[PDB]
Design a protein around this nucleic acid. Structure first.
Ligand SMILES: [Mg+2]
Ligand SMILES: [Mg+2]
Ligand SMILES: [Mg+2]
Ligand SMILES: [Mg+2]
Ligand SMILES: [Mg+2]
Ligand SMILES: [Mg+2]
Ligand SMILES: [Mg+2]
Ligand SMILES: [Mg+2]
Ligand SMILES: [Mg+2]
Ligand SMILES: [Mg+2]
Ligand SMILES: [Mg+2]
Lengths: 109, 139, 201, 125, 100, 51
RNA sequence: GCUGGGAAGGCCCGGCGGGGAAGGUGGCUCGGGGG
RNA sequence: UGGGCCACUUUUGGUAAGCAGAACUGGCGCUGCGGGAUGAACCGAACGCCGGGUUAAGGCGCCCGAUGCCGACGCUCAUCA
RNA sequence: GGUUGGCCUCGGAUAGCCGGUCCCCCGCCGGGGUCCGGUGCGGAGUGCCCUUCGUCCUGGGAAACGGGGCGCGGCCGGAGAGGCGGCCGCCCCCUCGCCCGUCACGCACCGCACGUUCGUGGGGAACCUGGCGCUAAACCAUUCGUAGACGACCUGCUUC
């Protein structure tokens, strides 16, 4: 009946210039462009939802081609509204520039 | 072309910084970048303030430069800057932004319903006016 | 965002607009830049023309047909500037470069759309008013671009239709205000709700 | 929202006649508390509305061990007549207070959603 | 937009074939039928009007007459010859008169 | 080191590549610039080199 | 908590005063204006 | 092992040298890592396999992590900046 | 495999802008000059539009010169990449859909994820069901010699 999640972009991995720590990812939440605004989203569950070829079991539904890698926002990155996120498996590099959903689930408001 | 000038007595609106949202009076001018400023009736004690954070209003008070805060306050209250400011379209635009930002979820719902009905009646009258304007027949 | 971001190149600085655009297309956004002949470059026209002529001199001595390709249209000049800010030799950079479309003038898909503006790249705010600048359209025309005249005529014809559309828009807005005065007794109930909550002062 | 239960789960009923939510449990970590409230003092929540009351009841394979004949019977959860009684008992004194404040029932009928321009960190709930 | 005339000669039609010997010579047989029916005639009039309104330069497709030459080749040579000197309306009327 | 005596280059680089023409007819590639003042006329023709 | 037992500052038309001026108020003079 | 080489500083021959020869300490050789785009020696720091936090030197338009600060004050127009 | 409402458009200035309005000129609309407003842009992209629980009794308002047809037919505009819009005529439906209320009901699946859209998505083979339509070339082989290392290229081959 409605979107119920914030739109985020998988910008890349936490990195130096020549080293890459793939275990954590940097996300760009839409409409969040200052560090002081990221406090709302800390600890919120985030999901990388993608499609594949083979059907997989869906909780509370028929099997379909939707898969998900779960995660959560850990802290703020930089001054411009970036956030860091840890997913249960490191995000694939093909998702860079694609959609991550920030779920509002563990709310504190 | 210019209508508002930095001058002694000119009332300015602080747009950002520690005193954002408040009115002040320019008491003196220093070094082209700052000004001795003072809001005695708006809770801004006398202090330096850059011109970059000021937005000049249309009010000008009458007091000599670097007069004491007492005389700045007397001019402010005699001119009733607080009431005159609140009656401007500038202040009412500021107030509307504030009460829109603090709108709750229920208030957003009621605004959605009121605007839904308001737009439907207006655009119905617009279509009615369009047909009346289209009913022209004269060579 | 998810939609196509259409930008008007007029009054924008070449490298400041290109830096914003390059970051946007790396973040998975489709970006269209129109009217690339209105883009400005800081510095007087002569020293910017010298910069392009030095670019023209760079060519492969052995086989210039292999060497650097010097694109003369302002849209292709801007496109090459964005490519200089992208990692175009990787698959990620090539995908980002494919999300960018550049045009001279405003072609029919986008001449009927609203066009955004990037203030952090506008000449009016980024450049001191006493400094000099060059037009990308004039610079391109004098290094080989052949379509300055035809794009000028097509832009004038487009602006005539846009003026007609704007006059109808004003007429509809005037009729909107007249209607809003007519239905006033039955609108003030919902108007006061809007005024209370900060919409419609 | 009505009360917190002994397990910390919230007991809620957005009245069943408004949005089809019965007397139900929910976790406070997974709800958003808005700033709009109805005075539900001097209402009487029945005493037996506890965690044991709301805990799921099910029973599979007591005497069945090897699965060759399907145990797909009883699967449909059935609303108890007692649950219908408690639903009417609470709704009979929650609804008259919802109707008291204008267009609150319509607010409870609608669902919450995110529009492409609105952002939760900027919203006041 | 390109508009071809009715009654295109055989030597011109050979240009459209790599093997005129084996072909059924079907080139432009359905196009020439729109010079006679009413719907096709209206479409041709629209194409000429659109050329008047939106085109800046027009050309005529002309072919040589192989049969008058002493050469072995019978396949004619087609080329576009630009029409200069006037308005687009004037050069379209001039070219329309010269068809066939 | 420099070549001992100057000599002009053999051939013209303006006619490269020296490949077989992709066409047999020979195409115009540039018609005379059109002016509306003149009467309507044709700008080209096709002939055959008899001898 | 300390400090110059902070420095400034606010209110008490601060009151009896004294002195100094200028980025000179009023007035006065001159030169330009609005009924 | 008994071919060394480099840097700050002192220092001899030489016009000088990425030259030749000394003193002192450190390094490279034997050494990976962050930075200097790149680089035996410079700057930071030395290393078991990892998670979290924080830094150094260095940076924070885009490539490319980080200023998308309503940063402060000036200086500067270059037709080889 | 992505995605999870739309914005259908003045030109522009920046030591200035925007809107509205009476007189003059240009074939009943635009351009000027007065005059009146607004300008930290409120005729505001910090904006606007749409807004999804569904139905049943049931009142009041909005409307009622209204709303919906992958229903027909005609016309108009758009060429810069028109791939898009708009206006009529006929026919059939409901007086419903929009706001505030009355009234109860729907699996209320017993706290839990990938839910919610674009979407009747793109692509490729195959099957059935109806209607309207079409019956061709390219290459080799042969020939030419305006061509040529070989490929390639220029040509001819039951009609007047
Ligand atoms: Mg010489
Ligand atoms: Mg040495
Ligand atoms: Mg060794
Ligand atoms: Mg050692
Ligand atoms: Mg080391
Ligand atoms: Mg390194
Ligand atoms: Mg270097
Ligand atoms: Mg670590
Ligand atoms: Mg760097
Ligand atoms: Mg970055
Ligand atoms: Mg120099």
């Amino acid at each position: 009946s409605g979107r119920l999640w914030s739109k985020a972009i998988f910008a890349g991995y936490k990195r130096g210039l020549r080293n890459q720590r793939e275990h954590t990812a940097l996300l760009k939440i839409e409409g969040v462009y200052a560090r002081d605004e990221t406090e709302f989203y800390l600890g919120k569950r985030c999901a990388y939802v993608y499609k594949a070829k083979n059907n997989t079991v869906t909780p509370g539904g028929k099997p379909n081609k939707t898969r998900v890698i779960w995660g959560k926002v850990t802290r703020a990155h930089g001054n411009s509204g970036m956030v860091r996120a840890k997913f249960r498996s490191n995000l694939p590099a093909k998702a860079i520039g694609h959609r991550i959903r920030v779920m509002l689930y563990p709310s504190r408001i | 072309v210019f209508r508002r000038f930095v001058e002694v007595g000119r009332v300015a609106y602080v747009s950002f910084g520690p005193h954002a949202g408040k009115l002040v009076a320019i008491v003196d001018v220093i070094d082209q970048n700052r000004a001795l400023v003072d809001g005695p009736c708006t809770q801004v004690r006398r202090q330096a303030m850059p011109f970059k954070c000021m937005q000049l209003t249309d009010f000008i008070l009458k007091f000599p430069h670097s007069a004491h805060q007492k005389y700045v306050r007397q001019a402010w209250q005699k001119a009733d800057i607080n009431t005159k400011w609140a009656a401007t379209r500038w202040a009412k635009k500021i107030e509307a932004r504030e009460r829109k930002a603090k709108m709750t979820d229920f208030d957003r719902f009621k605004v959605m319903k009121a605007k839904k009905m308001r737009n439907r009646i207006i655009k119905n009258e617009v279509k009615k006016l369009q047909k009346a304007a289209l009913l022209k027949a004269s060579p | 965002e998810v939609q196509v971001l259409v930008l008007d190149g007029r009054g924008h600085l070449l490298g400041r607009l290109a830096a914003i655009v390059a970051k946007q297309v790396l973040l998975g956004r489709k970006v269209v830049v129109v009217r690339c002949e209105g883009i400005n470059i800081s510095g007087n026209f002569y020293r910017n023309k010298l910069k392009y002529l030095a670019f023209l001199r760079k060519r492969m001595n052995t086989n210039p047909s292999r060497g650097p390709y010097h694109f003369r249209a302002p849209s292709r000049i801007f496109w090459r500037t964005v490519r200089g800010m992208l990692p175009h030799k990787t698959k990620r950079g090539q995908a980002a470069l494919d999300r960018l479309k550049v045009f001279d003038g405003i072609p029919p898909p986008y001449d009927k759309k609203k066009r955004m503006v990037v203030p952090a790249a506008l000449k009016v705010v980024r450049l001191k008013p006493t400094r000099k600048f060059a037009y990308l359209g004039r610079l391109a025309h004098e290094v080989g671009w052949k379509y300055q005249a035809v794009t000028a005529t097509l832009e004038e014809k487009r602006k005539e239709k846009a003026k007609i559309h704007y006059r109808k828009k004003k007429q509809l807005m005037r009729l909107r205000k007249q209607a809003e005065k007519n239905v006033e007794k039955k609108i003030d109930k919902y108007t006061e709700v809007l005024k209370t909550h900060g919409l419609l002062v | 929202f009505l009360k917190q239960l002994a397990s910390g789960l919230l007991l809620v009923t957005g009245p069943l006649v408004l949005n089809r939510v019965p007397l139900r449990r929910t976790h406070q970590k997974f709800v958003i508390a808005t700033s709009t409230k109805i005075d539900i003092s001097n209402v009487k929540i029945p005493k037996h509305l506890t965690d044991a009351y709301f805990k799921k009841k099910k029973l599979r394979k007591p005497r069945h061990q090897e699965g060759e004949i399907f145990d797909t019977e009883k699967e449909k959860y059935e609303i108890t007549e007692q649950r219908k009684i408690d639903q009417k008992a609470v709704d009979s004194q929650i609804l008259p207070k919802i109707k008291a404040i204008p267009q609150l029932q319509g607010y409870l009928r609608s669902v919450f959603a995110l529009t492409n321009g609105i952002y939760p960190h900027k919203l006041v709930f | 937009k390109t508009v071809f005339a009715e009654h295109i000669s055989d030597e011109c039609k050979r240009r459209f074939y790599k093997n005129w010997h084996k072909s059924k010579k079907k080139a432009f047989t359905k196009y020439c039928k729109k010079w006679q029916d009413e719907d096709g005639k209206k479409q041709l009039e629209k194409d000429f009007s659109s050329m008047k309104k939106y085109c800046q330069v027009i050309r005529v497709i002309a072919h040589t007459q192989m049969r008058l030459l002493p050469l072995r080749q019978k396949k004619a040579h087609l080329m576009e010859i630009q029409v200069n000197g006037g308005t687009v309306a004037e050069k379209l009327d001039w070219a329309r008169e010269r068809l066939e | 080191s420099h070549r001992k005596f100057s000599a002009p280059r053999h051939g013209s680089l303006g006619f490269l590549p020296r490949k077989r023409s992709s066409r047999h007819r020979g195409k115009v590639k540039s018609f005379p610039k059109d002016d509306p003042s003149k009467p309507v006329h044709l700008t080209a023709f096709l002939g055959y080199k008899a001898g």
